[PDB]
Design a protein around this ligand. Structure first.
Ligand code: DCM
Ligand code: DCM
Lengths: 282, 284
């Protein structure tokens, strides 16, 4: 039977290890990859190593809120953007004026206020720029056949203001047979560390939008540009490739929610998540 | 011997015919459709101009030089013999989008304007945009020279703020570049793909663009990666495509760049020669 689920991911690791080139403290890398994760009665949270579910869910709610304030995610116990908002790191980018935690116009601002003028992370941007996220939901409801259902985080004008240029440049949604699918264009993928988190994020987003629009989840298609393994991750990845995948968990949404801004972390339960030990890399 | 690059394109047609699902559109005539496909076409001593049906090379090349010029004027392309944008700049089509006031040929802030002036305020097709917004095309060329390992070598045409002014939202949302071993590859994210009429043309445009940037930056072409969103065949085109699928590809031609060129802006159509193109007859 053809490789499905987790074996797509593990297949991509294997391909990089065998066919990737040394491109540099260093990586093995392949340009252009594509995996398909079914979302039908399962949720692609990897089992060969524990994924930081809690980080996935809080990061996403933080984006949905429009927030560009690393402290606002750090308050929920998720520190993954904290280094990017530090005094020293902001100072190194020429942003000595800026308050600690102001990442600039990253995902949350691009998703809700694309094209508005960024001031700081505290400003009110109500009704300013394009609310791409709501515009996606509306189009799914009133014209599911549309082929322009896109949300774009890549904004060349705003790049120089951002703490980090986005890895997730864009996503597109698609509907047929009452199933909502999503494809992510990810320009750069650290396969050991980032990508399992990244798959879970966009699968989570697709579950959320499906729920709001009365559709069932379909596929998550993960497209990569620069797909790489850091050289220090090879040996641990070699341990991991030999573990037997367990079946994917399910994601249960615990109440009927009408607008995407109303989702809360306690609305979500991951069922039957049975991962092998977090055996992870630098 | 490694198989012919074109078999991926014909494979994709076949997967859609076999597994694609009925999905409609504005015209209502209908498609067979799959979401998410990817093909890889080597550009090493070969040019992926499809041979199972003749592709409108002249159209490919003039449109691209038109884009590079930063033009948003259907008439400047039409004047070179290439009518592909004309219907979209006609008084009638523009009126139908509620642009009753706009000059004929003004397509709004489409590819050329996004590539050379992203984020600038669009006025009309004749205005001067020199020094306004981001010149993505040049920033891409500059980054390829000075930092080839960079993972952010991107040129985006998808501008949500400008979408309402465009005569057509772009199919080619973005493209990304990559260098390793002095080879430049390119990946295209195409949000929507008419497999019969547009995809072959599209493969050649980005292959050609990569050849251009490689020549500017002292590199050799590597791969062109074509990634699709909604990949579809119009029901219209099923009989014609079943005809095309019967044909054996001929070997891909080669693309020759006839002089040394310093800046992307200085390419002319006469600079390019397609050697050894041996296509079967045009279809429909
Ligand atoms: N959500 C994220 C964020 C980051 N990265 C990885 C990819 C790169 O290794 C690095 C980002 O660096 P760069 O911008 O140079 O590609 O972290 C990732 O996979 N997923
Ligand atoms: N460069 C282009 C332009 C257009 N199309 C096709 C895709 C769709 O069939 C239609 C545009 O439709 P839509 O905007 O609804 O996706 O033409 C294409 O393949 N390539």
């Amino acid at each position: 039977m053809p490789p499905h689920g987790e074996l797509q991911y593990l297949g991509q690791i294997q391909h990089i290890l065998r066919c990737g080139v040394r491109k540099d403290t260093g990586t093995l890398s392949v340009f252009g990859m594509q995996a398909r994760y079914s979302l039908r009665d399962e949720f692609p949270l990897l089992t060969t190593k524990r994924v930081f579910w809690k980080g996935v869910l809080e990061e996403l709610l933080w984006f949905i809120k429009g927030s560009t304030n690393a402290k606002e995610l750090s308050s929920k116990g998720v520190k993954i953007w904290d280094a990017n908002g530090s005094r020293d790191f902001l100072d190194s980018l020429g942003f000595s004026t800026r308050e600690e935690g102001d990442l600039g116009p990253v995902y949350g601002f691009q998703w809700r206020h694309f094209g508005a003028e960024y001031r700081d992370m505290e400003s009110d941007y109500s009704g300013q720029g394009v609310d791409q996220l709501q515009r996606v939901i509306d189009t799914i409801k009133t014209n599911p056949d549309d082929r322009r259902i896109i949300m774009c985080a890549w904004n060349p004008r705003d790049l120089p203001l951002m703490a980090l240029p986005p890895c997730h440049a864009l996503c597109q949604f698609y509907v047929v047979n009452s199933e909502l699918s999503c494809q992510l264009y990810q320009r750069s993928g650290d396969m050991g560390l980032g990508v399992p988190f990244n798959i879970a994020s966009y699968a989570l987003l697709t579950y959320m939008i499906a729920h709001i629009t009365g559709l069932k989840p379909g596929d998550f298609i993960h497209t990569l540009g620069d797909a790489h393994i850091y050289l220090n991750h090879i040996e641990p990845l070699k341990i991991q490739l030999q573990r037997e995948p367990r079946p994917f968990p399910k994601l249960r949404i615990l109440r009927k929610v009408e607008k995407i801004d109303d989702f809360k972390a306690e609305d979500f339960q991951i069922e039957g998540y049975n991962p092998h030990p977090t055996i992870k890399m630098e």
